[PDB]
Symmetry: C2
Subunit: 296 residues, 2 copies
Amino acid sequence: GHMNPIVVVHGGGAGPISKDRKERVHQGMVRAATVGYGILREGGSAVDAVEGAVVALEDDPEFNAGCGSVLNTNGEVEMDASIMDGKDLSAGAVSAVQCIANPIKLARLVMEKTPHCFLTDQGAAQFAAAMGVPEIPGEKLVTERNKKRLEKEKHTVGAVALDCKGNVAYATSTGGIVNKMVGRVGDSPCLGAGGYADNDIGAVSTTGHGESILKVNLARLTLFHIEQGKTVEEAADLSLGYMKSRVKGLGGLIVVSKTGDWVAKWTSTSMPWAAAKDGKLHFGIDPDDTTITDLP
Amino acid sequence: HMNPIVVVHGGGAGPISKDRKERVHQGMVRAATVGYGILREGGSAVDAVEGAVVALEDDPEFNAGCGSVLNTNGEVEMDASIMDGKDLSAGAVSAVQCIANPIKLARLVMEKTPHCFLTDQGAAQFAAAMGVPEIPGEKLVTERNKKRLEKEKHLGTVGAVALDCKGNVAYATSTGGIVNKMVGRVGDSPCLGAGGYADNDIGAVSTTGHGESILKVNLARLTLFHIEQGKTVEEAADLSLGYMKSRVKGLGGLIVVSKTGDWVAKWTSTSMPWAAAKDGKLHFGIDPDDTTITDLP
Ligand code: NA
Ligand code: NA
């Protein structure tokens, strides 16, 4: 039974987003989801699809990952990412990486080129250089906008896919939270928290307050509820409902089951998202604002 | 109020040398006694697990702190995590260098930053801001490990869980990682839900074994999922370890305490040093069903 592929993408939990920013975010989200879907509709893998979708958002300055990442307490971008393949649980992740364009791609290089799942900071820096990953200057990742945020504070992106072959996958990438301590790691590179992908269940990517997501293991908690025979929506409502009640943390996630069902749900104010299935594009930011367009 | 309990584990690894066994034995006892010494004072589960793990870090026999296995550059890089079951408060550090006690650094992360996870450079910088002694790195490197890396060139994670006399639980885990690991490789040990989980509403787990496999199956929280579904602790431990072996071909072990004070130590590797203190007795084993149960003064 060859399945109808689906990709879902998110541009991060957010507070209120302005009318103008919404529109730029919309273009970036459509573009990411369009890249992802293209891979899937040419018979690509779920992993290829999630990596592609998230590179798109890393490169795009309107999203807090890669270029457009928030800056740590010291004005520099430090980035976290992870990828996971649902068929064998193979996984790749990186924490505290700097001076590279695409943390998610290196997260894949960890998964594919090493016996390990997770490299960090100085070690992740060395492995990149060794794999032929270029080093780009700091300001290349630093935007003027994120400088104003940092000074104003002082004084996450993801994807899930189901492919033709029935494989599920997730990728997540982030700059983290603004003015963070040097070396702060969030949920993104910690499988079970930043995401989790399993062919016997499905795949999820999360976003929001990184510490809360970790404490509760939101991704695996959503998939627990699914293994229990709750729908993708019900499952999201419980796990998010739990992070809210138990630890007062808010965020969002995206999930696709092995049966093809999907949903974006969030307890933050907004979470830009887009999905693609059966030549149709589903987009939303605020609850109920969802649109559907022909995606030929 | 609840009868307190501390379980400790050394590394879940292959067969152990005859003379190593004695040193290992005494190590378990030291750590379990520390944790139980803390509990018998009415002290917290967080305190006991920290104390137990601290002892194992300081003991050059165990793969954490002094005596950590060596990476590829012949250097010590350490991970640790600790978690408060009360409200799920947690702290963690990874690839940390030239300090005695990663576990204490993670507790500081939990209680003295608004974060739960620091790595490498930032962690060392936080270590400074907290006055943690930056010790000569060569203090942590041992001859057994120096020699062991030369061979691989051409024990495993330690941990503790505890339920205190208020019924709170905690876990703590610390490691030097794996022999000849790549530079800045980070295992399961500082990863919430993999290396360990603690939740007053279910129990506490600390894990050991193939870190990548443990990370892939989210070993610690998995074990808890089963306890939720009604499993006994050993049934749950059997089920999670069982799945790890069948799904990622990984071998490991775990200690668990449930919210009501049911507890077990189980492993799928050949061996796992483990000790438990409860009801005035101390339990200790290395091999499946070799348990000695003796009196604790
Ligand atoms: Na970006
Ligand atoms: Na030690």
